[PDB]
């Protein structure tokens, strides 16, 4: 993820002002789980939806 | 008979030991209101302590109902972590023409005795 660049898929975080900004860290975590899902795939065993 | 001998009339009991568990901060704030609750160390922390009041009350009379002089006094003890007791206070209530001992009236309501009788549901005839 290049600096100064917001990815296309990203999570946000609520600032003390009340607004929701791009958060580098949260967004990283999400995109890594999304990378693993693309390679290994995701299980939903025991998930009730 | 008919006695009007109030000069030579008195009451000099040793009251039953009364204990208070100080749980809250509006229990400690009440005890600090009372003139008669002298502590040796005024800053002493009472919270979650078990105080026992070993109290005796001299009382002289002027009439059938009104007391000439009331006097309640005795050590205030705290139960330590080890369950040995230590003196950390004195009761020192003195009065003139009174209708009551407030110290014992306080400890009855806001405290308890060491033993508590509990009645069976039904009295059992023995014989």
């Amino acid at each position: 993820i290049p600096r100064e660049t917001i990815p296309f898929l990203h999570l946000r975080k609520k600032t003390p002002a009340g607004d929701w900004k791009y958060d580098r860290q949260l967004s990283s975590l999400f995109l890594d789980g999304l990378e693993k899902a693309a390679f290994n795939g995701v299980t939903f065993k025991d998930k009730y939806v | 008979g008919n006695y009007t001998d109030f000069e030579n009339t008195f009451q000099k009991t040793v009251e039953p030991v009364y204990q208070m568990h100080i749980k809250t901060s509006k229990d400690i704030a009440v005890l600090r209101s009372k003139e008669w609750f002298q502590l040796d160390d005024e800053d002493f922390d009472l919270l979650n302590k078990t105080l026992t009041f070993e109290t005796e009350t001299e009382v002289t009379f002027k009439n059938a109902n009104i007391f000439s002089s009331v006097k309640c006094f005795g050590p205030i003890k705290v139960e330590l972590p080890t369950k040995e007791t230590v003196e950390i206070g004195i009761v020192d209530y003195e009065a003139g023409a009174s209708h009551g001992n407030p110290v014992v009236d306080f400890l009855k309501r806001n405290g308890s005795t060491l033993e508590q009788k509990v009645n069976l549901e039904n009295p059992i005839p023995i014989a």
């Binding site: 009340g18 | 407030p102 306080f106």
Partner: protein, 48 residues
């Protein structure tokens, strides 16, 4: 469109729910201790 902020700085007091709740605590606490001391001083004067 005009958006008028007639809120006098409450934006900036953070965790206003739990703040406001702490303030009500401190008034009640104080009122209750004071009212409990006042009840006992009446009883322990009524008795004398």
């Amino acid at each position: 469109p005009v958006m008028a902020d007639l809120n006098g700085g409450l934006q900036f007091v953070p965790e206003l729910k739990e703040f406001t709740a702490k303030l009500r605590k401190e008034l009640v606490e104080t009122s209750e201790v004071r009212k409990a001391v006042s009840i006992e001083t009446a009883l322990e004067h009524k008795v004398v």
